[PDB]
Write a protein that holds these residues in place. Sequence first.
Motif, PDB file in Angstrom:
ATOM      1  N   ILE A  24       0.835  -1.201   0.000  1.00 58.68           N
ATOM      2  CA  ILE A  24       0.000   0.000   0.000  1.00 58.68           C
ATOM      3  C   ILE A  24       0.874   1.257   0.000  1.00 58.68           C
ATOM      4  O   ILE A  24       0.614   2.221  -0.725  1.00 58.68           O
ATOM      5  N   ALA A  25       1.928   1.238   0.801  1.00 56.13           N
ATOM      6  CA  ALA A  25       2.867   2.360   0.819  1.00 56.13           C
ATOM      7  C   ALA A  25       3.393   2.653  -0.599  1.00 56.13           C
ATOM      8  O   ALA A  25       3.384   3.803  -1.063  1.00 56.13           O
ATOM      9  N   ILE A  26       3.805   1.602  -1.302  1.00 57.02           N
ATOM     10  CA  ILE A  26       4.384   1.756  -2.638  1.00 57.02           C
ATOM     11  C   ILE A  26       3.332   2.175  -3.678  1.00 57.02           C
ATOM     12  O   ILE A  26       3.603   3.022  -4.547  1.00 57.02           O
ATOM     13  N   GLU A  27       2.136   1.595  -3.581  1.00 55.61           N
ATOM     14  CA  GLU A  27       1.032   1.979  -4.460  1.00 55.61           C
ATOM     15  C   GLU A  27       0.739   3.474  -4.360  1.00 55.61           C
ATOM     16  O   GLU A  27       0.731   4.186  -5.364  1.00 55.61           O
ATOM     17  N   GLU A  28       0.516   3.953  -3.143  1.00 59.01           N
ATOM     18  CA  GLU A  28       0.175   5.354  -2.938  1.00 59.01           C
ATOM     19  C   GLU A  28       1.340   6.275  -3.285  1.00 59.01           C
ATOM     20  O   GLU A  28       1.142   7.365  -3.817  1.00 59.01           O
ATOM     21  N   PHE A  29       2.556   5.828  -2.986  1.00 56.38           N
ATOM     22  CA  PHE A  29       3.740   6.602  -3.323  1.00 56.38           C
ATOM     23  C   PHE A  29       3.860   6.718  -4.841  1.00 56.38           C
ATOM     24  O   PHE A  29       4.107   7.800  -5.372  1.00 56.38           O
ATOM     25  N   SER A  30       3.672   5.600  -5.532  1.00 54.39           N
ATOM     26  CA  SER A  30       3.792   5.569  -6.984  1.00 54.39           C
ATOM     27  C   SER A  30       2.668   6.356  -7.655  1.00 54.39           C
ATOM     28  O   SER A  30       2.841   6.872  -8.763  1.00 54.39           O
ATOM     29  N   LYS A  31       1.522   6.451  -6.983  1.00 57.97           N
ATOM     30  CA  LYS A  31       0.388   7.204  -7.509  1.00 57.97           C
ATOM     31  C   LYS A  31       0.590   8.702  -7.324  1.00 57.97           C
ATOM     32  O   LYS A  31       0.293   9.496  -8.223  1.00 57.97           O
ATOM     33  N   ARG A  32       1.098   9.097  -6.163  1.00 61.42           N
ATOM     34  CA  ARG A  32       1.185  10.513  -5.867  1.00 61.42           C
ATOM     35  C   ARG A  32       2.341  11.234  -6.563  1.00 61.42           C
ATOM     36  O   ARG A  32       2.226  12.411  -6.925  1.00 61.42           O
ATOM     37  N   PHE A  33       3.455  10.540  -6.743  1.00 60.37           N
ATOM     38  CA  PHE A  33       4.650  11.196  -7.248  1.00 60.37           C
ATOM     39  C   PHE A  33       5.156  10.598  -8.565  1.00 60.37           C
ATOM     40  O   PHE A  33       4.854   9.453  -8.908  1.00 60.37           O
ATOM     41  N   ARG A  34       5.907  11.408  -9.308  1.00 55.78           N
ATOM     42  CA  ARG A  34       6.624  10.964 -10.495  1.00 55.78           C
ATOM     43  C   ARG A  34       8.076  11.442 -10.402  1.00 55.78           C
ATOM     44  O   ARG A  34       8.422  12.229  -9.514  1.00 55.78           O
ATOM     45  N   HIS A  35       8.909  10.948 -11.314  1.00 59.50           N
ATOM     46  CA  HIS A  35      10.268  11.456 -11.476  1.00 59.50           C
ATOM     47  C   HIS A  35      11.080  11.523 -10.181  1.00 59.50           C
ATOM     48  O   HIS A  35      11.745  12.531  -9.933  1.00 59.50           O
ATOM     49  N   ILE A  36      11.025  10.480  -9.357  1.00 62.07           N
ATOM     50  CA  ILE A  36      11.832  10.452  -8.139  1.00 62.07           C
ATOM     51  C   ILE A  36      13.325  10.557  -8.465  1.00 62.07           C
ATOM     52  O   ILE A  36      13.826   9.910  -9.388  1.00 62.07           O
ATOM     53  N   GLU A  37      14.029  11.398  -7.721  1.00 62.55           N
ATOM     54  CA  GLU A  37      15.476  11.457  -7.825  1.00 62.55           C
ATOM     55  C   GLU A  37      16.058  11.371  -6.422  1.00 62.55           C
ATOM     56  O   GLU A  37      15.696  12.166  -5.550  1.00 62.55           O
ATOM     57  N   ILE A  38      16.940  10.399  -6.196  1.00 65.42           N
ATOM     58  CA  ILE A  38      17.518  10.230  -4.866  1.00 65.42           C
ATOM     59  C   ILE A  38      18.680  11.206  -4.709  1.00 65.42           C
ATOM     60  O   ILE A  38      19.519  11.359  -5.607  1.00 65.42           O
ATOM     61  N   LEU A  39      18.688  11.903  -3.579  1.00 69.48           N
ATOM     62  CA  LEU A  39      19.682  12.927  -3.300  1.00 69.48           C
ATOM     63  C   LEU A  39      20.766  12.431  -2.350  1.00 69.48           C
ATOM     64  O   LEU A  39      21.924  12.842  -2.449  1.00 69.48           O
ATOM     65  N   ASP A  40      20.384  11.570  -1.417  1.00 70.85           N
ATOM     66  CA  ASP A  40      21.318  11.059  -0.416  1.00 70.85           C
ATOM     67  C   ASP A  40      20.755   9.838   0.293  1.00 70.85           C
ATOM     68  O   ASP A  40      19.537   9.709   0.459  1.00 70.85           O
ATOM     69  N   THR A  41      21.639   8.934   0.696  1.00 69.38           N
ATOM     70  CA  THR A  41      21.233   7.763   1.465  1.00 69.38           C
ATOM     71  C   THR A  41      22.217   7.498   2.582  1.00 69.38           C
ATOM     72  O   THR A  41      23.386   7.867   2.496  1.00 69.38           O
ATOM     73  N   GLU A  42      21.748   6.834   3.627  1.00 70.57           N
ATOM     74  CA  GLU A  42      22.633   6.428   4.702  1.00 70.57           C
ATOM     75  C   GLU A  42      22.123   5.101   5.252  1.00 70.57           C
ATOM     76  O   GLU A  42      20.948   4.983   5.588  1.00 70.57           O
ATOM     77  N   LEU A  81      32.971 -11.981   4.023  1.00 76.06           N
ATOM     78  CA  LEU A  81      31.975 -12.648   4.844  1.00 76.06           C
ATOM     79  C   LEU A  81      30.951 -11.675   5.409  1.00 76.06           C
ATOM     80  O   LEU A  81      29.816 -12.054   5.707  1.00 76.06           O
ATOM     81  N   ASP A  82      31.349 -10.419   5.578  1.00 76.30           N
ATOM     82  CA  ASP A  82      30.423  -9.421   6.104  1.00 76.30           C
ATOM     83  C   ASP A  82      31.019  -8.030   5.912  1.00 76.30           C
ATOM     84  O   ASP A  82      32.241  -7.865   5.886  1.00 76.30           O
ATOM     85  N   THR A  83      30.153  -7.037   5.741  1.00 78.50           N
ATOM     86  CA  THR A  83      30.573  -5.636   5.695  1.00 78.50           C
ATOM     87  C   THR A  83      29.594  -4.759   6.462  1.00 78.50           C
ATOM     88  O   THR A  83      28.430  -5.107   6.619  1.00 78.50           O
ATOM     89  N   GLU A  84      30.066  -3.605   6.910  1.00 78.82           N
ATOM     90  CA  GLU A  84      29.203  -2.619   7.544  1.00 78.82           C
ATOM     91  C   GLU A  84      29.730  -1.245   7.191  1.00 78.82           C
ATOM     92  O   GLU A  84      30.910  -0.973   7.378  1.00 78.82           O
ATOM     93  N   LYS A  85      28.870  -0.391   6.656  1.00 74.62           N
ATOM     94  CA  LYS A  85      29.326   0.927   6.236  1.00 74.62           C
ATOM     95  C   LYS A  85      29.342   1.923   7.397  1.00 74.62           C
ATOM     96  O   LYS A  85      28.626   1.766   8.381  1.00 74.62           O
ATOM     97  N   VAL A  86      30.199   2.929   7.278  1.00 76.76           N
ATOM     98  CA  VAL A  86      30.214   4.046   8.205  1.00 76.76           C
ATOM     99  C   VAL A  86      28.963   4.879   7.982  1.00 76.76           C
ATOM    100  O   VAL A  86      28.676   5.247   6.841  1.00 76.76           O
ATOM    101  N   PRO A  87      28.192   5.138   9.059  1.00 78.95           N
ATOM    102  CA  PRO A  87      26.930   5.890   8.978  1.00 78.95           C
ATOM    103  C   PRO A  87      27.176   7.394   8.896  1.00 78.95           C
ATOM    104  O   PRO A  87      27.082   8.125   9.886  1.00 78.95           O
ATOM    105  N   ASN A  88      27.520   7.856   7.705  1.00 83.80           N
ATOM    106  CA  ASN A  88      27.893   9.250   7.535  1.00 83.80           C
ATOM    107  C   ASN A  88      27.666   9.617   6.083  1.00 83.80           C
ATOM    108  O   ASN A  88      27.866   8.782   5.199  1.00 83.80           O
ATOM    109  N   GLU A  89      27.227  10.844   5.836  1.00 77.70           N
ATOM    110  CA  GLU A  89      26.926  11.276   4.474  1.00 77.70           C
ATOM    111  C   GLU A  89      28.127  11.890   3.766  1.00 77.70           C
ATOM    112  O   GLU A  89      28.108  12.064   2.541  1.00 77.70           O
ATOM    113  N   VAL A  90      29.164  12.221   4.532  1.00 79.45           N
ATOM    114  CA  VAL A  90      30.360  12.811   3.953  1.00 79.45           C
ATOM    115  C   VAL A  90      31.460  11.768   3.839  1.00 79.45           C
ATOM    116  O   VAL A  90      32.137  11.673   2.820  1.00 79.45           O
TER     117      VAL A  90
END
Lengths: 367, 367
Positions: A329-347, B344-353
């Motif tokens: 449901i999360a993905i359905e509603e997300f995919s319905k509401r938005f387009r052109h997702i661009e990821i800026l950062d992940t951790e 066998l295993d990895t873990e990333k540093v939790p940091n954006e920089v």
Amino acid sequence: MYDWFSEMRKKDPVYYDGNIWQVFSYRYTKEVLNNFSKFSSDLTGYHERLEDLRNGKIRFDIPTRYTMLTSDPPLHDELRSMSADIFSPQKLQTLETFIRETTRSLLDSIDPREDDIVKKLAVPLPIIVISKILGLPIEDKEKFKEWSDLVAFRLGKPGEIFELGKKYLELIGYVKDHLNSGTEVVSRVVNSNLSDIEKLGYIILLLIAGNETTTNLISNSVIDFTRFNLWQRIREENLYLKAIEEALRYSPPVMRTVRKTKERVKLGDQTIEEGEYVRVWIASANRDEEVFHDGEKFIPDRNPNPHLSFGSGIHLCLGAPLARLEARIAIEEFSKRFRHIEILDTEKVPNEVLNGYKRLVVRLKSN
Amino acid sequence: MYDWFSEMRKKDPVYYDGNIWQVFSYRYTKEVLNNFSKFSSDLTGYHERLEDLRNGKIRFDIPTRYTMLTSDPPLHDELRSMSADIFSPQKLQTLETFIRETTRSLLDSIDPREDDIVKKLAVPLPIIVISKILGLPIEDKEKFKEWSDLVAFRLGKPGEIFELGKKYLELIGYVKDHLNSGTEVVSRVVNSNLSDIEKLGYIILLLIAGNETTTNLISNSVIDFTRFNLWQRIREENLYLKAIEEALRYSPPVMRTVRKTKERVKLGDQTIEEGEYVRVWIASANRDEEVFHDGEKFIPDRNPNPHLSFGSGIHLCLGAPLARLEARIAIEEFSKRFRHIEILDTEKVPNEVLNGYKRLVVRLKSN
Ligand code: HEM
Ligand code: HEM
Ligand SMILES: Fc1ccc(-c2c[nH]cn2)cc1
Ligand SMILES: Fc1ccc(-c2c[nH]cn2)cc1
């Protein structure tokens, strides 16, 4: 995590690392999970201390040491029987509207220019839904997220010794305080004449233990569908159901689990002594080429897809139909509401058991 | 991190996110880095406070607010020129044997059955080498590791965090305790016309700031060479130099850096006002197809390879020749000493920089 395990899976699928045994192939991972009589989940003293819990000799202890998750039959079966109907198809069908509405209400607060999908959607959704199901209120949203992380971290280190901290003590106090507002399964637990510690453990398992994993399923799905550019195809070909299953296979929220041998037993070509720990890698099993053809490819309509991301056998995840439904449901509603997702950062979450994102920052377009 | 920026890099290379500017293409990233008069590194009030520093009116502050890293010309050049020769080709050549012998002793610590190469090799090597160069003793191994982490964390948040904390305070105490026992460049700093606060900052920067980044280069290199099955080819064709350059491009230890506009400026089609923060993504720049053909492929003998992982312009990493040498010797000795690495295993540093590994658990075969 990248699939490091291919060669291990091929040449050393059952491996002793000097301390414990590690299992990497689907055949032997599934075999361990299903053979509860030789590979025990009694890792936290539950069977050993059952007498002293029930007779009251133990008053102060860690509730999550004493749940169905770290028990064997008959105890396991007695406990799980009490909540086996908690996420029944009928119950979930009526709940669909509330889950969809909650999802949409969460999307309402997203800033399309830049926002953290973990903070805005993946973390709150499971917490709000399970509160509704159990009839246990969310007073402090902050504390619930803290409890969810703490409990998940602890479940990831069975048998390891951790004194109750300030936060876990507050969680316990909350549960004590709110017993009688609960719905039917909470009542069953309170009326059961299980020990106080067990009742706490049981309630905390249901209320809290499923949040972090479901959160990670949601984040992992957004990540995977974006990485492989699958959003339009998922919308157009209605692949939501199968796409969530591929996200589960390819990015399992729970990477591994562990058992302890009850007797000397043969696994593959290896002989494992009684009392040894056996770590079983769901993440590696899920890429096993003998089960999943082109197993390193993300195939959103993969079928069959017998991944082990919810386990296998008597401990097969009680929450599985709820987590599947929430994520879909999360993905359905997300995919319905938005387009052109661009990821800026992940951790990434810094944990070897729990596979997910601490931060998932994105830019979105409406309509 | 996976190359998320591909989208941004081609359609929105200069983006205002509602709060700051973010730059994703090679052309504009390098332009920002090289244009210091318009894009300032003065994020900590160093220039504003210079007079009061030098006449003793500021006696308490965060030392790492006042280093060459967060200064513009002429201050920057006055500061860097004091240690411009510290890692000269002649000085590093005399250090090769010590680095090699140190590395081999570290490799001795690795249990081939299973071990963490972050803990055994990548973390200790830079600490041991910089301590030797500066003549500042490693009295407590664990403390130096804690300091390397906290200083790296703080440098990634320029101008934020105005509190010190117990660990930082012990670091300051350590430096004060050893001000007069170091080698020539330490003595240069200590006997200079700089304020006490600046001397502390300068010493911290040289002693501590390079450890976590260099560690990550070593780890990321081991990851990349393993992932792409390149060890045999790197040995046979003697590709160590270019392979480490390709690790730097593909897996930069520093993902991004920040500038502040001194005046309204044009960057691409965009107009950036004075006083705006501009975040520059080295990690995205390094994948720019307009500069690096087949930029998403890891090509261990890639050449030319003008990556931005050590920056560009007047702040171009002072430690680059040392980090390159340590990584080369680490990878060389590791590749000679072991075969058949399996992760066998990895873990990333939790940091954006900071882009690296907290854990890198492997199994190995000797010689
Ligand atoms: C994507 C989300 C989830 C994943 C990947 C997941 C995974 C798993 C796995 C692998 C197991 C078996 C562990 C073992 O065999 O040692 C398990 C068990 C369990 N799960 Fe989950 N789970 C998820 C969500 C949930 C939720 C939302 C709930 C409850 C609200 C939940 C409740 C439970 C319970 C009570 C057990 C113990 C079952 C037993 O011991 O019989 N799970 N889960
Ligand atoms: C792989 C390892 C390393 C990487 C990726 C790296 C990266 C960088 C980058 C990108 C900058 C420029 C920052 C900016 O323009 O704002 C820089 C500057 C600097 N680095 Fe490194 N660095 C590394 C290792 C080291 C080491 C080992 C040392 C010293 C022992 C060191 C000392 C310095 C200093 C003093 C500066 C400031 C130069 C100036 O402001 O003129 N670095 N580094
Ligand atoms: F380490 C772990 C292992 C399993 C869980 C879990 C499974 N179903 C709900 N929560 C959480 C943390
Ligand atoms: F966030 C950062 C940014 C840069 C460094 C750095 C560059 N050269 C040595 N250390 C450390 C942490």
